[PDB]
């Protein structure tokens, strides 16, 4: 109850108006601060204990950021638009060694979002569903986080069917992108950990904190 798609949409509209890898890490650090402000605008999120908020964000920041720059790259040819205003072309990522994952982002995420014209409201709800991850370890009250997730996709299903009556499978189509997002989120982390290990590629404070333990 009390999980209007209007509040979710506002969260999205409120937080967003040479080495390609270095530019990506710099952009992720920038968005991490914005991610916190976005979360706060999500209904009931701020009402959760401070500790559970840290857990939810530290467990989903990567998938939440990946979902954002992807949907933002829908109108882009073969690349993505970074929050910093920089465009990372497919060939540029390839010439940097991170072509395998970058291609997975374009094919499994960016392209798919574009094929179904996923709107901002739909993007917001999905991210909200990710934020409210009841499987996050250490949660003081996983059941509560679970109840919130259910309220999100309940409002999302209502949005669809009503906004896109002619598309009865839209709701499932959106939810069936989370697995790809999960798989891609995990691989991106692996790369970031390797980048931190090798030493090359500068990494800012907030990004570095997210790469902490656990």
């Amino acid at each position: 109850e009390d999980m209007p798609v209007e509040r979710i949409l506002e969260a999205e509209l409120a937080v967003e108006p040479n080495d390609p890898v270095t530019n990506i890490c710099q952009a992720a650090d920038k968005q991490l601060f914005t991610l916190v402000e976005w979360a706060k605008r999500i209904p009931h999120f701020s009402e959760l204990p401070l500790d559970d908020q840290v857990i939810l964000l530290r467990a989903g920041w990567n998938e939440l950021l990946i979902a954002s720059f992807s949907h933002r790259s829908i109108a882009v040819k073969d690349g993505i638009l970074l929050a910093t205003g920089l465009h990372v072309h497919r060939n540029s990522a390839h010439s940097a060694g991170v072509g395998a994952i970058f291609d997975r982002v374009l094919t499994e995420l960016v392209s798919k979002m574009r094929d179904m014209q996923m709107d901002k409201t739909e993007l917001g709800c999905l991210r909200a569903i990710v934020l409210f991850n009841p499987d996050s370890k250490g949660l003081s009250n996983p059941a509560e986080v679970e109840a919130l997730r259910e309220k999100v996709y309940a409002s999302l299903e209502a949005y669809c069917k009503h906004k896109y009556p002619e598309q009865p499978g839209r709701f499932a189509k959106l939810l069936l992108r989370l697995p790809a997002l999960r798989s891609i989120g995990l691989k991106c982390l692996e790369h970031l950990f390797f980048f931190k290990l090798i030493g090359d590629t500068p990494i800012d404070t907030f990004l570095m904190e997210m790469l902490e333990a656990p």
């Binding site: 840290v54 530290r58 404070t205 904190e209 902490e212």
Partner: peptide, 11 residues
């Protein structure tokens, strides 16, 4: 741990 994240959420 998690200095930054905590400070940002509290504000």
């Amino acid at each position: 741990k998690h200095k930054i994240l905590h400070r940002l959420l509290q504000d």
